[PDB]
Amino acid sequence: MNVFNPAQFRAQFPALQDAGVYLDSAATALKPEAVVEATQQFYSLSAGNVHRSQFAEAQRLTARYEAAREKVAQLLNAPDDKTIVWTRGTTESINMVAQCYARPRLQPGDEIIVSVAEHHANLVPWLMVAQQTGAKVVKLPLNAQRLPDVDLLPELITPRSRILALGQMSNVTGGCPDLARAITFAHSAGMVVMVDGAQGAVHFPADVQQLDIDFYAFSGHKLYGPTGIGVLYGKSELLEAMSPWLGGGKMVHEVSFDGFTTQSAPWKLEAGTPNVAGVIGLSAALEWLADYDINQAESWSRSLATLAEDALAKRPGFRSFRCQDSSLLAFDFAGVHHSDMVTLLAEYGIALRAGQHCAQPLLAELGVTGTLRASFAPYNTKSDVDALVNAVDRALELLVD
Amino acid sequence: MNVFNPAQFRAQFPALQDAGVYLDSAATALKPEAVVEATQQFYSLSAGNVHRSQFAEAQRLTARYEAAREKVAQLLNAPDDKTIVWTRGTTESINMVAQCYARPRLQPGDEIIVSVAEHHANLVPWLMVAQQTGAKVVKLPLNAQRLPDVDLLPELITPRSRILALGQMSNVTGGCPDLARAITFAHSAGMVVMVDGAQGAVHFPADVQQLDIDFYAFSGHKLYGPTGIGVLYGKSELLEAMSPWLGGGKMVHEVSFDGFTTQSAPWKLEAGTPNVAGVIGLSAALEWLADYDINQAESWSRSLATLAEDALAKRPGFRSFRCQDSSLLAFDFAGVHHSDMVTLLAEYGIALRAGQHCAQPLLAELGVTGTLRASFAPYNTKSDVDALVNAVDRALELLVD
Amino acid sequence: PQFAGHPFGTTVTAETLRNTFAPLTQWEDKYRQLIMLGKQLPALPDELKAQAKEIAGCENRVWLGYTVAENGKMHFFGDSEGRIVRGLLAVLLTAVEGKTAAELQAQSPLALFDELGLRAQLSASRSQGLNALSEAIIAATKQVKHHH
Amino acid sequence: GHPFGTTVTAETLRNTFAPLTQWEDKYRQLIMLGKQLPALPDELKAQAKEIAGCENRVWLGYTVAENGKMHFFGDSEGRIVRGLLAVLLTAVEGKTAAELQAQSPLALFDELGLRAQLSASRSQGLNALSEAIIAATKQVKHHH
Ligand SMILES: *Cc1c(COP(=O)(O)O)cnc(C)c1O
Numbered sequence A, B: 001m002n003v004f005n006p007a008q009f010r011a012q013f014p015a016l017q018d019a020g021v022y023l024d025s026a027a028t029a030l031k032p033e034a035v036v037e038a039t040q041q042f043y044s045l046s047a048g049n050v051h052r053s054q055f056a057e058a059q060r061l062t063a064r065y066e067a068a069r070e071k072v073a074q075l076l077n078a079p080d081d082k083t084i085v086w087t088r089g090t091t092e093s094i095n096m097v098a099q100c101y102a103r104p105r106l107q108p109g110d111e112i113i114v115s116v117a118e119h120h121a122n123l124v125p126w127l128m129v130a131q132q133t134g135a136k137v138v139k140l141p142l143n144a145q146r147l148p149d150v151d152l153l154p155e156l157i158t159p160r161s162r163i164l165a166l167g168q169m170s171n172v173t174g175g176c177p178d179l180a181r182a183i184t185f186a187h188s189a190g191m192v193v194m195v196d197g198a199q200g201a202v203h204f205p206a207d208v209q210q211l212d213i214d215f216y217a218f219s220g221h222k223l224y225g226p227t228g229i230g231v232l233y234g235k236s237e238l239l240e241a242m243s244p245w246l247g248g249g250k251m252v253h254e255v256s257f258d259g260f261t262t263q264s265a266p267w268k269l270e271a272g273t274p275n276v277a278g279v280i281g282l283s284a285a286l287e288w289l290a291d292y293d294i295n296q297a298e299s300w301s302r303s304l305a306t307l308a309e310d311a312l313a314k315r316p317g318f319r320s321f322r323c324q325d326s327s328l329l330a331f332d333f334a335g336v337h338h339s340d341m342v343t344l345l346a347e348y349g350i351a352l353r354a355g356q357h358c359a360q361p362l363l364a365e366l367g368v369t370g371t372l373r374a375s376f377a378p379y380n381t382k383s384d385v386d387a388l389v390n391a392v393d394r395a396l397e398l399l400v401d
Numbered sequence C: 001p002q003f004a005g006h007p008f009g010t011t012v013t014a015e016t017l018r019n020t021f022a023p024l025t026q027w028e029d030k031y032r033q034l035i036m037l038g039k040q041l042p043a044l045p046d047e048l049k050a051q052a053k054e055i056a057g058c059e060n061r062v063w064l065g066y067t068v069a070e071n072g073k074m075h076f077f078g079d080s081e082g083r084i085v086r087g088l089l090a091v092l093l094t095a096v097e098g099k100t101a102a103e104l105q106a107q108s109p110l111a112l113f114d115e116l117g118l119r120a121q122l123s124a125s126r127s128q129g130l131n132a133l134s135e136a137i138i139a140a141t142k143q144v145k146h147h148h
Numbered sequence D: 001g002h003p004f005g006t007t008v009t010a011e012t013l014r015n016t017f018a019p020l021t022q023w024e025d026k027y028r029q030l031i032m033l034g035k036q037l038p039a040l041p042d043e044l045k046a047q048a049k050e051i052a053g054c055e056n057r058v059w060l061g062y063t064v065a066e067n068g069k070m071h072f073f074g075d076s077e078g079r080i081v082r083g084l085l086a087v088l089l090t091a092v093e094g095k096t097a098a099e100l101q102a103q104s105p106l107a108l109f110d111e112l113g114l115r116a117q118l119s120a121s122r123s124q125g126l127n128a129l130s131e132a133i134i135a136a137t138k139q140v141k142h143h144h
């Protein structure tokens, strides 16, 4: 019953041959032909009511656009498609919550609990709003297993706690904290939870009703989709409670020089001409993605990561930061600088990423200034793992001692 | 750019056959093959270190991305490419100035002068910030020629005037006010000027140094380019004075739980993964556009608009709102609702726009609730004008009592 | 009960419409007849506009309101500024009107546009107010659970 | 200080890199060349420009003698970039601003046959260093 076939999956990506051994999907994902083709067709046709030749193609693009919200809803098991808002990415999505929900509510002394495992996107906006309101950011540290210490949360929560900023999945460790429990604790304290799902949406898409998530954000480009497009999910009560974001066309209902009224959500939060290309392309990605069992596709991705880790572990000086056998593999080698390794691995045909991964506090907590990161997608193979392992050996021989 | 050839120009747009008679470019512009091809190539290849086969194509895309700022600067005769900032669109660009420049400076009682001819994008943000700071929006009305009354400006300026929000070109009348003089008056009063160039950039691109413009905004999709991408130009002193916009990766320099430092402009104002597709595609549009003399191409567009107006004026009950013989032709017919007309014109193969054009105050001033708008681009022909005129006749015969 | 009234559902029935639209094959003539049908919908006064929902679109303004009789039969009233949409509203009012909420939720009003051969026209004006009216009727029909 | 420009010259580099055709050996020799660049203390890092990239941190600073000759100093965390910096320092040290703007430092990488390696590490710090030298050479006229 829907047996996942990695080869079938692979076949859909025209980038793959030229890409070599691509292990940087956690940065940005490759795109299936469905996405590439929808985009070209959108830009190759008129957006008007007149279509002389290619009506069928025009009707297809309209269909894609109008269903786009529903398709995101189906991915998140959201109750209604009006709970979905279009943004330019996870970063904007989170900033919107900070400014439109938090800022008008936070009083001096109030507290925002943020995990050390957070991407800058789910940390800097809280720092900014804290400065603006006189609130304070409080750190939620890692446990022995390198996950945000959710069991410590009751002790960090005080009567002045208001917001919990927490990532579904780290972009460094690939680790997922016990989100269900976290949310129970936050809600008991009357707090609202911002979940960064930029990685989680790709690997373990969150059931927002079951988990009872208040806010959820992700980016289209990590989800095998276009750049410049992202999503904010919110409970309808919360989207109603939010102030308007940007001001302009579409979001307004009536405007005069004496003032203005706005539409309801989600249109309240979507000023100006939307990135129609992004929405259509993301819809193409989702429709396509819906054909595969993500659980099976993720298992495959993880299998490869495990083979990679076990093989590299045989080399001395090796260290992994990987949690819960994830498809993301952060690592390093004693005495070897990560920038050097990345350059040489490139030369051997392996494309991966080094650096801080927009996660400075986490790396400081881990006691390193940077790391290598290999991230496995369902379009990778066992040959890719072998090629990585072999390349590392060659690299180490050039760099060691 | 030796002599502008409309046919040569036309040939570049693959949408044109299917599009029929497209007269809605002021809403969104059709795209040349150069833009369509860059976008497809970008999504068809990896963004990583490794390129096994298509290195040449990958070098080309990188070249396009890195030059993208310079190409915008050349269009605006900007002194340096660091004065260019990437945004979603004109709407975001303007909101940024309102929130990052105006909001931390405005005191209760301060005044923002905004013309009645402004798009909602250059009005709602000022209304929003006024409420947030205790400042007030003051209206700059139209003169007898239906342009913002720049000669009245000294009277409207008081010691509490701080900002002048003014459009380079109306999306309804196509009219351009005396911007050079306006700026002189504003600068004498120590005010800063926000110029909405969403239309102007396409037809009469502003020389920002000569005009001494403080801020200038436009959208890529009106400029024969991709959706979801826009520009904010600012004087460097002003960009340096601005607060950070969104918080997150790229814009930050160092981050801890105790606070953060930011990069300089323009990176200070560009949080998160950029819409790389948009930037590349816009670059492709600009490089291509650079081949043609805009002055000649605009003259052509206007010639067609004039023929259209004179022909339609022979039909009784006709009224035009068009200024300065522009390429935009807003109009209506006595006793005929604009929505009805647009539907029927569509059926005759003419793609047109009706409604309020995100410009309610202007239409209230003009004493109408909505209008039809035909907008002419350099890819239009005289055959298009004849088809419009003929279709209107048929429409009128069905609709007139 | 009523003021300006309207003949749709009572005087003007599905049969009456069918006699008018059935023999029409040319799309131009169909629109002509829709516009003419819309003239039979009276101008709704300001006081009746106050008790109707105003669905102000970018394109076109449209009004829709309802009353329910002791019978349980629903009376519908409304208006459009656009004349092509006004004709389509007239057809819509013929399909509903004098019908109970149970009857309404069990029938699709869109079936009448098929019988009259007006799907192309309906389709072309959906976002100019027809979507809104149709969904406003569905919203109004859902309100007739209450007061038991 | 550092030996580049004084005890390690263009000639000496040329003897080392000229006979190398295999790319793997060229990198090995760059890494080894980088060992000859001392670590650089905190105090000297304070007077150098810090060009902190996403990939790799790099430092570059300068001083001018009464001669008009420019002394350059710097550091990299990445070992390949450290070798490339060592080549760059050989090209520009002990030379005046007029001499510098009159010859491109990049010409040395051609003579040593290292254009592929330079290219591969441009965004890992080499762009920054090269342009920082150009900015430093422009200041050294005396004033603008
Ligand atoms: C279209 C337009 C805008 C808004 O541009 P977006 O790309 O929708 O943000 C602003 N001003 C004018 C004059 C316009 O024509």
Ligand SMILES: *Cc1c(COP(=O)(O)O)cnc(C)c1O
Residues within 6 Å of the ligand: A026, A088, A089, A090, A091, A092, A119, A121, A122, A167, A169, A170, A171, A196, A197, A198, A199, A219, A220, A230, B272, B273, B274
């Ligand atoms: C990439 C990423 C983000 C930011 O996404 P953008 O699309 O760059 O705004 C936020 N959080 C996590 C965990 C990520 O991996």
